């Protein structure tokens, strides 16, 4: 009944539409909020944050058998912490190069890497060693340690309504200790923030 590391499947009810089946791998259970799971779903590149046993859109949650197994560490270790250019191919067959940063080796799914993008600051997961060999990934050349860890603090901001909403600092990056993951209560994406000295 510990589901970290397990493949899972469940119904997902988007709005009032019919229940659809979802399949994914549970990467982690958030220490500062153990009802919060990070999930890598097949088909979504983005890591999801869900209270799997509390969220009302989730139904019939079951543990599945593990995925059929398969069989370079220096390349992966030099990639981590680094800024990168990641080349995606537009419908035109042309190339759009998103600048981003590689944050860590993903848990449970070791071939996979946590990555985030300047044009999209949420937490993605990709198998970057393939994209590097293919040439589609270039590694660019190269406060969070002064300040004590913010992990577990509950964040608070205002919307343009003046309505205040909350979130939670769930993780500090081991490779770049000024980078933090925030999961807001009203979204399932994991947003990446940098701790900056003011002015």
């Amino acid at each position: 009944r510990n589901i970290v590391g397990c493949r899972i499947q469940h119904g997902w009810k988007e709005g009032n539409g019919p229940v659809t089946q979802w399949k994914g791998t549970v990467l982690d259970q958030v220490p500062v909020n153990p009802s919060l799971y990070l999930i890598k779903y097949d088909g979504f590149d983005c890591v999801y944050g869900l209270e799997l046993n509390k969220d009302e859109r989730v139904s019939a949650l079951e543990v599945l058998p593990d995925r059929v197994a398969t069989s370079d560490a220096h390349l992966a270790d030099t990639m981590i912490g680094k800024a990168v250019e990641h080349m995606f191919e537009t419908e035109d067959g042309s190339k759009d190069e998103w600048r981003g940063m590689v944050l860590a080796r993903a848990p449970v799914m070791n071939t996979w890497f946590y990555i985030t993008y300047e044009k999209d600051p949420v937490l993605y997961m990709y198998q970057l060693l393939d994209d590097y060999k293919e040439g589609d990934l270039r590694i660019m050349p190269d406060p969070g340690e002064v300040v004590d860890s913010l992990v577990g603090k509950q964040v608070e901001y205002a919307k343009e309504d003046g309505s205040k909403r909350t979130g939670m600092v769930i993780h500090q990056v081991e490779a770049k200790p000024s980078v933090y993951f925030i999961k807001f209560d009203d979204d399932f994406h994991i947003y990446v923030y940098d701790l900056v000295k003011t002015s």
Partner: peptide
């Protein structure tokens, strides 16, 4: 959903002084 571009308030008011959390996109 639109994530705040900057965060500098905690509910217990303990956000460290002189710093801000900036969305990775700024």
């Amino acid at each position: 959903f639109a994530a705040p571009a900057e965060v500098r308030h905690f509910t217990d008011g303990s956000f460290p002084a002189g710093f801000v959390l900036q969305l990775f996109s700024h």
